[PDB]
Design a protein around this ligand. Structure first.
Ligand SMILES: *[C@@H]1O[C@H](CO)[C@@H](O[C@@H]2O[C@H](CO)[C@@H](O[C@@H]3O[C@H](CO[C@H]4O[C@H](CO)[C@@H](O)[C@H](O)[C@@H]4O)[C@@H](O)[C@H](O[C@H]4O[C@H](CO)[C@@H](O)[C@H](O)[C@@H]4O[C@H]4O[C@H](CO)[C@@H](O)[C@H](O)[C@@H]4O)[C@@H]3O)[C@H](O)[C@H]2NC(C)=O)[C@H](O)[C@H]1NC(C)=O
Ligand SMILES: *[C@@H]1O[C@H](CO)[C@@H](O[C@@H]2O[C@H](CO)[C@@H](O)[C@H](O)[C@H]2NC(C)=O)[C@H](O)[C@H]1NC(C)=O
Ligand SMILES: *[C@@H]1O[C@H](CO)[C@@H](O)[C@H](O)[C@H]1NC(C)=O
Ligand SMILES: *[C@@H]1O[C@H](CO)[C@@H](O)[C@H](O)[C@H]1NC(C)=O
Ligand SMILES: *[C@@H]1O[C@H](CO)[C@@H](O)[C@H](O)[C@H]1NC(C)=O
Ligand SMILES: *[C@@H]1O[C@H](CO)[C@@H](O)[C@H](O)[C@H]1NC(C)=O
Length: 742
């Protein structure tokens, strides 16, 4: 029942809500001033009932857009029957291509507007997830930009801008919602449910790792909405945490005027049960509202704010504040007044660009290529003369391609189907399942391998192990897949054995790493609707891999070394440090790892130290930048040459480390920039230019303050660290973010 109010011939035509010359806030305020208390409360939840006597339509706040129109009112046939399903964010982020994220978000927003013009979708979306994949067992890590907060911040900016449009204040395409704020990275590990979890986070970790990306989403991307998490932090449920919502988000992080906060579905209720922070549903609703949660996902507000009023927990003005914020966003989206002409044909066109396929091809990571077995070129292995064995619980994957939540897709291309369409003769055998103990399927799998010229095993994990409400307990390969893989390796007989490790989280593949008969190892995440074509084309060399890992592949014992609910990044107790930045152990495959189908030579651009003064750089002008921390202080440059026989895109991560600047402990390293050079021809020498903002050089004190310290920094290209630059910062320490108090 989604429609638009009639501001020309409807009951509101005479009121300021329908005066396109007024300010958006004043329009929404007058509209709310036309309500009764019952009508007002009826619109405090995600399923807002509207006001019938005023011609005000019902509005649904909950729309899913994480990686496409993941849930909409689809038709059974014809128009509005499907929508593009892109890879899960974890795979897209591994392509290290900011413009890719922006374009995906813009396409999603176009199709969303098209469905909303047809009444089948909302005007605000509960995306993007910009939490980090801190601990490898998290069942929603597939929905995140990885474990590094800088990548999460850039993803937030590109996605939120693509979703909202170029003019978010005046002609908003769709309102985005940064989630989940904050400290939400665990579902149920060892019965530590997100609904009741009370996570202990130091102010230092809060400032340095858990909040920064939400600061970017607010100040730089001007996100219109933020969603507060189910969990509590240092004893306070996120949606009842006046410190998170007012002090930080609204007062420090630059949340747009009249931006609205939504609770998770239903975090407001969890304030009462199971957190126990409130003694009743009415008290929970009042506390959430007073802390700043404007709109409830659920029915706690709509069914219990009368009790809140009756108990003197708040006033009607308190309730009006949140509804006014929500409808201010709606007014800025043209609700009561360009994007309104988008229609089904625009969905068809944008899907037909196949940006989903491109995202998969760009994001897939090559972890192992022994003796250049890959690519299996169409010349060396012609389709008409080649049989490929497609084995594994991912070989026939269609819905598995789309990840935890997805809507109607135009099509789902399994690896098997893709190799068949290409004209290969394919022997398919499941072999085993994701988490099975049976061997009944091994014989058929081995038989398919015996008759084949190449063996492709597609397996790993999927949503039967990692999902919302479902955390992993082990990070080893599950089931008996490794056993079957080893049997395949033993019987291969110099036939290429390509292993496809799928899923959002990583699995300990050290076994495959040291196994000589295992020719190649690729990570495919959740590659979206065209995953089969992307995987096939990477294997054949029709596309060349350049993705890198945005998550660390830990040894299995990592998941037993310390409690996953430990929020401390820096090593302490049995925690060896978490994330590439602080991890003191030996990873199986490191964050930032990735191979290419060609060799690239990395040379210094000027065959050299960079000395800079804190006060000089921090007193400069910063036109077009909201903060001086965004100012480029140098360009990290190197020469990249294609010394191989195939043209390939090239990706680079720039890492920084220090041993003197600021307080100990000192990080192993941290990501300061990244780039992707497209289509580097054979022999070409392209130059790498990565700006390094002064923020990258700041470090966080225990009070949570961001400070630029004097000392020596080292900047290194990728994991090989061949090209290097020394940066000496002189002067006095200066605070660039003054962490507020409670
Ligand atoms: C980082 O990531 C970005 C992606 O955001 C990437 O830039 C993109 O590169 C791709 C590859 O060239 C571009 O894809 C093509 O886009 C056109 C339309 O683009 C127009 O509109 C956009 C959005 O407004 C503009 O930005 C852009 O400049 C153009 O004006 C599509 O029409 C293309 O589709 C055809 O090719 C696909 C394969 O590439 C096919 O799958 C598809 O079916 C289409 O086939 C065509 O030919 C067929 C016959 O061969 C025919 O049957 C079909 O009917 C059809 O005519 C294609 O999707 C994309 O636009 C770029 N986006 C931007 C924003 O620039 C960067 O390259 C990347 N950086 C790296 C990797 O280093
Ligand atoms: C590029 O986009 C087109 C858009 O249709 C894809 O072509 C469709 O693929 C499905 C699955 O194979 C077919 O059932 C449709 O009939 C195809 N339509 C047309 C018009 O050809 C194509 O697969 C995409 N290329 C990729 C994903 O690599
Ligand atoms: C889906 O949208 C159509 C067209 O707007 C409408 O007729 C139908 O009732 C909707 N179904 C829902 C919202 O369940
Ligand atoms: C409060 O409102 C809810 C939802 O409309 C209703 O179910 C409940 O009976 C109301 N309580 C009182 C005391 O009116
Ligand atoms: C492979 O996938 C297709 C499409 O979902 C399905 O019809 C078929 O039963 C699957 N085969 C096996 C062996 O699971
Ligand atoms: C980085 O390179 C651009 C383009 O060459 C240049 O304009 C900019 O000043 C450089 N950044 C520096 C010098 O900090």
């Amino acid at each position: 029942p989604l429609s638009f109010p009639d501001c020309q011939n409807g009951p509101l035509r005479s009121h300021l809500i329908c005066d396109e010359s007024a300010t958006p806030y004043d329009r929404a305020a007058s509209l709310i001033s036309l309500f009764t208390l019952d009508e007002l409360i009826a619109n405090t939840g995600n399923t807002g009932l509207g006001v019938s006597r005023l011609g005000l339509p019902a509005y649904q706040v909950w729309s899913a857009a994480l990686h496409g129109l993941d849930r909409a009112n689809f038709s059974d046939s014809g128009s509005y029957n499907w929508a593009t399903s892109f890879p899960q964010p974890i795979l897209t982020t591994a392509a290290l291509n900011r413009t890719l994220i922006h374009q995906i978000a813009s396409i999603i927003s176009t199709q969303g507007r098209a469905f909303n013009n047809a009444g089948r979708y909302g005007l605000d979306v509960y995306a993007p997830n910009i939490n980090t994949f801190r601990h490898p067992v998290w069942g929603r890590g597939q929905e995140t930009p990885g474990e590094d907060v800088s990548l999460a911040a850039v993803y937030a900016y590109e996605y939120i801008t693509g979703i909202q449009g170029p003019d978010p204040d005046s002609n908003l395409k769709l309102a985005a919602t940064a989630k989940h704020y904050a400290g939400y990275d665990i579902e149920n590990w060892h019965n530590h449910s997100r609904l009741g979890n009370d996570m202990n986070i130091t102010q230092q970790d809060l400032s340095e790792y858990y909040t920064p990306q939400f600061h970017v989403a607010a100040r730089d991307a001007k996100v219109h909405s933020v969603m507060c998490a189910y969990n509590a932090v240092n004893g306070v449920p996120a949606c009842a945490d006046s410190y998170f919502l007012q002090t930080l988000l609204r007062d420090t992080f630059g949340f747009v005027d009249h931006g609205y906060v939504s609770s998770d579905c239903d975090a407001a209720y969890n304030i009462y049960n199971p957190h126990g922070y409130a003694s009743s549903q009415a008290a929970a609703a009042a506390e959430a509202i007073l802390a700043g949660t404007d709109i409830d996902c659920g029915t706690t507000y709509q069914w219990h704010l009368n009790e809140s009023i009756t108990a003197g927990d708040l006033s009607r003005d308190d309730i009006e504040k949140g509804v006014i914020r929500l409808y201010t966003t709606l007014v800025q989206a043209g609700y009561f007044d360009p994007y309104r002409d988008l229609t089904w044909s625009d969905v068809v066109e944008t899907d037909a660009w196949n940006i989903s396929y491109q995202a998969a091809t760009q994001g897939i990571v090559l972890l192992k290529n022994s003796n250049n077995v890959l690519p299996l070129t169409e010349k060396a292995y012609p389709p008409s003369n080649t049989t490929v064995a497609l084995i594994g619980p991912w070989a026939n994957a269609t819905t598995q391609l789309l990840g935890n939540y997805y809507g109607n897709a135009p099509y789902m291309i399994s690896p098997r189907a893709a190799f068949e369409e290409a004209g290969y003769n394919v022997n398919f055998a499941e072999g085993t399942g994701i988490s099975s103990t049976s061997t009944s399927g091994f014989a058929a799998a081995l038989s398919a391998a015996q008759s084949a010229d190449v063996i492709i095993y597609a397996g790993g994990i999927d949503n039967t192990l990692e999902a919302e409400a479902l955390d992993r307990e082990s990070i080893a390969w599950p089931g008996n897949q490794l056993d079957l893989i080893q049997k395949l390796a033993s019987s291969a007989g110099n036939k290429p054995l390509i292993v496809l490790q799928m899923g959002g989280g990583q699995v300990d593949s050290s076994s495959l790493k040291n196994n000589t008969n295992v020719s190649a190892l690729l990570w495919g995440g959740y590659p979206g609707q065209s995953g089969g074509f992307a995987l096939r084309d990477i294997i054949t060399g029709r596309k060349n891999p350049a993705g890198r890992l945005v998550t660390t592949q830990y040894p299995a014992s990592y998941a037993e070394e310390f409690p996953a609910t430990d929020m401390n990044l820096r090593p302490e107790g049995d925690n060896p440090g978490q994330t590439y930045k602080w991890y003191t152990g030996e990873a199986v495959y490191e964050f930032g790892h990735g191979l290419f189908y060609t060799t690239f030579a990395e040379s210094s651009s000027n065959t050299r130290e960079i000395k800079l003064n804190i006060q000089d750089i921090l007193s400069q002008t910063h036109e077009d930048l909201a903060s001086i921390t965004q100012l480029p202080v140098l360009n990290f440059t190197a020469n990249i040459q294609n010394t191989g026989k195939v043209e390939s895109d090239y990706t680079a991560m720039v890492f920084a480390n220090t041993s003197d600047a600021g307080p100990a402990p000192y990080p192993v390293k941290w990501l300061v920039g990244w780039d992707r050079l497209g289509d580097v021809k054979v022999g070409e020498t392209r130059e790498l230019r990565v700006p390094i903002e002064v923020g990258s050089f700041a470090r966080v004190n225990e009070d949570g303050d961001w400070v630029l310290f004097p000392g020596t920094f080292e900047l290194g290209l990728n994991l090989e660290r061949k090209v290097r630059v020394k940066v000496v910062l002189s002067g006095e320490e200066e605070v660039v973010l003054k962490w507020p108090g409670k």
